[PDB]
């Protein structure tokens, strides 16, 4: 049956090719300590430029060619070679054989390091073949292939003999560049360092390049050939064809598309505390818990594009801050004040003062704006409690800023604590880590010390269909890891086989097994509920709020009996050990690493 | 052995064996974005639907058979069969051979392939065998076995030759029905699907039936032979005997045991705002962090039972909340309101009102009570401050509600972080995670994405005895991993063999070996103290205050111990590398997995 | 390239051994909310005895010997032995061959099998050898060794054939006796008793000995020859020598080194509450997260040594606390009062009063110092209101105490929330755990249920070089997984081979290979930024001033590159699944076991 638990739409999890420019920054030293660094409270809005990730679509053009140095001995066959290589599809195969025809020859005539080389299909000659959707062309902006074969050259022994195979790959994919637009990403796992807007039109070819004009072939008037149709489409596209050393990329060309007003605010933070310390303005935000330790001077509208737009932005920002929380809570201090953290972090900072000691407006005004870049006839200031309450201001400055430092280092340790927590979190499930941190459905994975970022093909909780056959026995009795599922993009989507992943993840896996431990009784997150299989067969579903339908309740003292039946045996059934027998998943690992210790010992005399 | 510091009793790792499958709420969806919804605050009290597990005792009965279809070669032999099957011990063997005799024949007689096959013991015929303790326990009325090994027939080659072995299995258990009492969980590992009050008397035919009338023999007034004494130690018991298709249950029969207050006060949350939104109200709890999107109308005391006791419980809860935090803090706003969060959460909610512009009593409750389910002259109202204060009501409500929304966003993101955290936390240690989230000392394990529960027995240390020398001698060089213990369920119980798990855990199995790591010096929590084994030999315990728990005059950061060369295997040996040195469990896995790379099973010509 | 992202200093990975000095404690059950009470608000000041552990230098002396009992049969050669030992260099060879010469014979004369055996070099007679400094000439005090030499006995088959080799080792290192000074711990991973102040003079003889005076060799005016140069150094020094059973220690000797003032303020805790409960005072701090159950009376200046300095320090702590928060926040009542949180935690207290009923000072100081260790005249308290308010004070006591208890329980969870997780945090990150609790240091590890520490590492944090060789060919073509790095202890130190673990860490190992994931593009945490290799070829660094992290402005929610076919691909190419994903990372770890889970036997004729 198709999925019914509509309380949570599924996640497609194909391995992503991240960038990644978003990673957990290394935690920070904890901030400054005792008194006056003229700790100054105020609302800052911190900005950077817009990175303008121009999006479009392109298509990849190459031909993977493989040769098998089969080793024909006496009666035996060593594959002394099965070598495969991507080889850039020529402009001509695109224009005619693909764009006009939609096919690719069973021979590939390709470049390889200044040497033109040909490859054929099965010790025989050329044949155009249709680009059926590639192997693993699903789950992505599709690709198209021709076969899934390997050929063995006709048998002649006592010599390394080579059998050939040629296949085409022409693939519609999505594409992302960014300002400063001298680069772009490729939706197969590739990147090219050339300016995205480089077509010969409008002078956008005068824009950056990092390559020569011997592989860029701009067909304006091109006809976008839908590779799901292998047939042309709507009014002519300007497809640029960059014949890379491995493929060709054809893409809609567009003008340079600059970005103004590019300055885009990181954050508004009212809890913006100034520490004039270490020859530096130390801006502490407890909203994001960062001390930008920047230069003293200010940052002008001149070092940015249209500083007036950001002036509007920040004025409205600070208004939203104050009016909502501080109608009668603080007093505006001076102007917003602009500070550059290297890497272009802009701080616009309207200092604020607490209503403590309300007698010091015009005066603490001056004293703390001091940092932007006998016989007598009484002549005291019109209320010497101006000066008196200034001395009291300095007094208060002492404990107030001391408290600020203390609570700020509290914030420091809190955030530095959780930083590594989230490191281990993305170690666990970076898909979920994204589905929270950006909050959206996503395909992710951990690339060592960096992550892989993407978004997956949509599947709601009605397109997937669990299988009930839950084992492979060619390897005698190997039950699959997580529910085998036939699913589809839409009702017209391709019903394709994979395994469920944890929390509605849809991995294409259809070999993901592990031994069939008797005693299998497993829930699995199924849409907005759970599937449940008993001993590798489907028992039943259960909605999330339908299993006891409460959260943190109960006692909860449930008992059980001891070492039990369900008996594959010689003594004291073993298949529950094959269900992690205490063990202690972690100790499961800690014991199975004791098995390497035996891979010898058929090879010794004493 | 009892330690110098033992206040932590010892919870000796009995993993669940079968039931149960307790479910766990998914991370609640994190909230929305901008303002107005009425957001009307006050106390909520959620009732749960009285669900309760009935508890009583039962006992299980089945003979298993093992057969050896040996094929004998010339002097060699293949086991063309070692087959083990289970057979419910029928009514009569319980009544006589068990209740009257406590003994079990050496033949097991059971249907198989639709044919009743008999099995003997040792190719020799029926013989009643003592129920010998299949284990040693103190909690769920443990059971008894009869044999350990299987038999092989004489040598007759070139034809499948068969030798037989029969075993009996009789084991008492605790039994846990659950409201609404139609099926019940067991202790051995099976689940039975009959009503608990089901039987033959007091209209128990109306009780949930899902089994035929040929296996259930309600032999009541029928003595239960205490087989921990192998003797009837009871009044003649109300036993019901279901010869289930795989086993036999004999259990106390009880009248129908329902209870009367259908809703049970499950939660209280003073942070209860009505977010008037989405064709609905959303009861938003910033104490247990929910937003139930319930209809505007309320669940009546009519469509659930006892609409008075529940209401009184809620009234008392609300009075408690008020008196505990609001003797003069908020305003009694309207009546409480009694909504069904789908699946059966009862939400009784007495609204509140802060003293923010406290000059709107008679009206504003009135106002929000909107949401439970020619010649001329001057005539002003009695105090148009009514209308002025209502204008202000709306206008301050707006940003107030926004602030509530945002603090709730913080609420949700935090809770959803923590959920995923606990996921891997229980995958590391479900014992600790569960046992503390519940308070009970229990043993849990992974059923895919949920937990299985079994309560551990807090024992004293002296029952448990870590031996001094630990190592496996299969091949020289493997000193056991976790502290081998001779322990006792009772004070004078059987000292049985297991291994100490982490921190009063006792992994019952003993196969966990490790490098006899030359320089191995490891503590393990022993009560409130720590046991020491230097190179897998016991020195001493140390209290946690002697191993120097958290300090401040240290950290200040004086240096500590460090390590240098030793004299196996030039510069120092591998014995310590394999002691999970560093390692770094993550590093442990990432390296040790490379043993596929450390695997070469191929020796051919190329 | 040398380490240039040194916005984070780099740290080599040493082998840690710990106690630990700031040790993980276990979460605890937390007691009563409402009952036995009159919580005592006010400061406490916990003292803990500063032992002031002695830190100084020493030197280890031994000769590691090896004898190979090769097994020479027909023509083949098994090793019926490679026997490897440390023989303590005699105090004499230190005196002259090492301190006067710096040399030491190729032979060690030491007991084995209760037989004073000899060990020579290469089946020929004795010769002196030079102690060339090892890698242990750094990372502690200096150290000296010889090259990795081994000899195989002459060829005489059909008899156990024996060949010898002996290598000398002198290793000065850093040493830590800890007060109460009956002992001292070593830099090699060794402990010994017999307090190091065992010199004959100053009366230090009474200072603890655990070992007979047979091997205490006090040579005053005994310099330590610079063994990096075999030249006199360390102007003649009071060196005491213990020819331990494995080595000899030579260490500077000092007077007793007392530790007054021992008892030292652990912390000053503002929020402190006394629940006079369970026949005890329970001191609760939601200010430093503790719940001790301490003694009721006051630990006098007498029951511990020198308790006056403590009193001064506590006066200081208390006045600082008041001034920092309580100029007008609470009411002082009562003295400081001592309390023994057993295990050696002192608790001075200065009780407070909330400003609730600010009129009852004179009364309340009495009422709660009650718990330290007709013609009528209206005769009331000075104002009967005092007797009036004393009433509600009681009726204030419990509910307040209730809240006091109540909130604490919340705190309880929070505290009890995270303890074990920190333990699991190290399971990934002794790096992070140490760089937080230690602060900048690294290298902890898990010895059973205890932590292990090493804080000495001197690093040329500028000289760290990721190798541009990214493979091993032993397993033909195995790309190394973690960044191989040439580094050095000092700016001119030897660039030595190791592997760049995460975050400024250089493990001494280089074996971590992997199958070359085509398309490899990997950062690894490299100090002030990351290192990047592109398909196992150095791409570039990136400092952390330019690469994003989770924030608001332009999303930063988009998809990135997707994976597709590459050219190792028939189906499921190994090289790329290497990148920790198919999956379901945890299932990655699981299938990592699947390999033993399908094969250990090759053949058997059924």
Author numbering:
A (entry chain A), B (entry chain C), C (entry chain B): 104 to 476, 491 to 723
Copy the relevant paper text.
All four glycoproteins are essential and sufficient for HSV-1 membrane fusion and entry.
Here, by using a molecular dynamics (MD) simulations and sequence-structure analysis guided mutational approach, we successfully trapped the prefusion conformation of gB and determined its structure to sub-nanometer resolution by electron cryo tomography (cryo-ET) and sub-volume averaging (SVA). This proline scanning resulted in wild type (WT)–like expression of full-length mutant gB only with a proline at position 516. Compared to wt gB, the cell-cell fusion activity of gB H516P was reduced to 6.5% (SD: 3.2%), only slightly above the background level [1.6% (SD: 1.4%)] of a fusion-null construct. This domain showed the best fit being docked upside down, in relation to the membrane, into a fist-shaped density, located about 2 nm from the membrane.
